Every structure is written in C-alpha cells, then in structure tokens.
Design a protein around this ligand. Structure first.
Ligand code: CA
Ligand code: CA
Ligand code: CA
Ligand code: CA
Ligand code: CA
Ligand code: CA
Lengths: 63, 63, 63
C-alpha cells in the first residue's frame, strides 16, 4: 500500500541512514579510544606514584 | 549464471546483512563500554583502598 | 551531469564501501578489545604485586 515513489524513497533513506550510522560509530570509537587511553594513563601514573611512596617507606623502615 | 531474480535476492540480502551487522556492532559497543567503565571503576577503588593503607602505615611509622 | 552508467557505478561503490568500512570497524574492535583487556590485566597484576609488598611491610613493622 505504498506507491513506487514512496518505496524507492524509503529504500534510499534506509541505505543513507546506514552511512550515517557507520560515521556515528567511527566518531564514537575515536572518542572512546581516547578516553580509555587517558584513563589507563592516569591509573598507571597513580600506581607509579604509590609504588615510589611504598619503596621509600621500605627504605626508611629497613634502615 | 544466476537469474535476475536470484541476483536481486542476493543484492538485497547483502544490504540487509549490513543493517544487521551495524546493529550487532552497536550492541557490542554498549556492552564493551559498560564493561570497560566497570573494570576501570574497580581498579580505581582498589588503588584508593591501597593508598589509604599506605598512608596509615606511614603515619604509624613516622609517629 | 553524469550518465546513468556513471551514477549506477557510484551508487554501487557507495554501498561496497560501507561493507568495507563495517569490516574495518570489526577488525579494529577485535584489536582494541584485546589491547584493552591486556592493559587492564597488566594494571591488575601490578596492583596485586604492590598490595603484597604493602602487606609484608605492615607485618614487618607491626611485629
Ligand atoms: Ca536521508
Ligand atoms: Ca534521501
Ligand atoms: Ca535477510
Ligand atoms: Ca531479503
Ligand atoms: Ca569497489
Ligand atoms: Ca564496484
């Protein structure tokens, strides 16, 4: 119960919307890779600072 | 060596399968973003607990 | 100002390129999930080693 013109418009919109969704996925991955990398960086940095604090406490106690 | 009917069916299946694959990617990203966020949460929480333990040990030793 | 032959070629290339981009996204997700999992592993392992070091220092001090 759609005309050929309506059906063709809908089929093209479906394909156009996939092109948009693929771009939205790529943009999300760019943001999420950066976010994740920064968070991992920050955790590593905090662990490195705490490791130094523990090694100094060891040295102060053992001496 | 395919009829027009077979070729048209295959071309449509190809496009339909892309729509399904994009949805599978979106569902995976939803799960993976949540997983990653929770794991990062848990590591931060464990580091915060260990930091408190180290600061208390410092205070007990220095005093 | 394109012939029908040119327009049909371009429309098919557009759809073919989406199939390629979806595969590139899947390949990236495979690599990024593995990378992220390994990095999280490594942070957990480093925290577990530092936790053991802190517990031993506690035991040595308290005794
Ligand atoms: Ca549109
Ligand atoms: Ca349109
Ligand atoms: Ca189908
Ligand atoms: Ca079909
Ligand atoms: Ca091509
Ligand atoms: Ca082609």
């Amino acid at each position: 119960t759609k005309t050929n013109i309506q059906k063709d418009w809908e089929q093209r919109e479906f394909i156009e919307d996939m092109s948009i969704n693929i771009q939205k996925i790529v943009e999300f991955l760019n943001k999420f890779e950066l976010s994740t990398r920064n968070k991992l960086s920050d955790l590593n940095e905090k662990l490195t600072i705490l490791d130094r604090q523990v090694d100094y406490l060891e040295a102060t106690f053992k001496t």
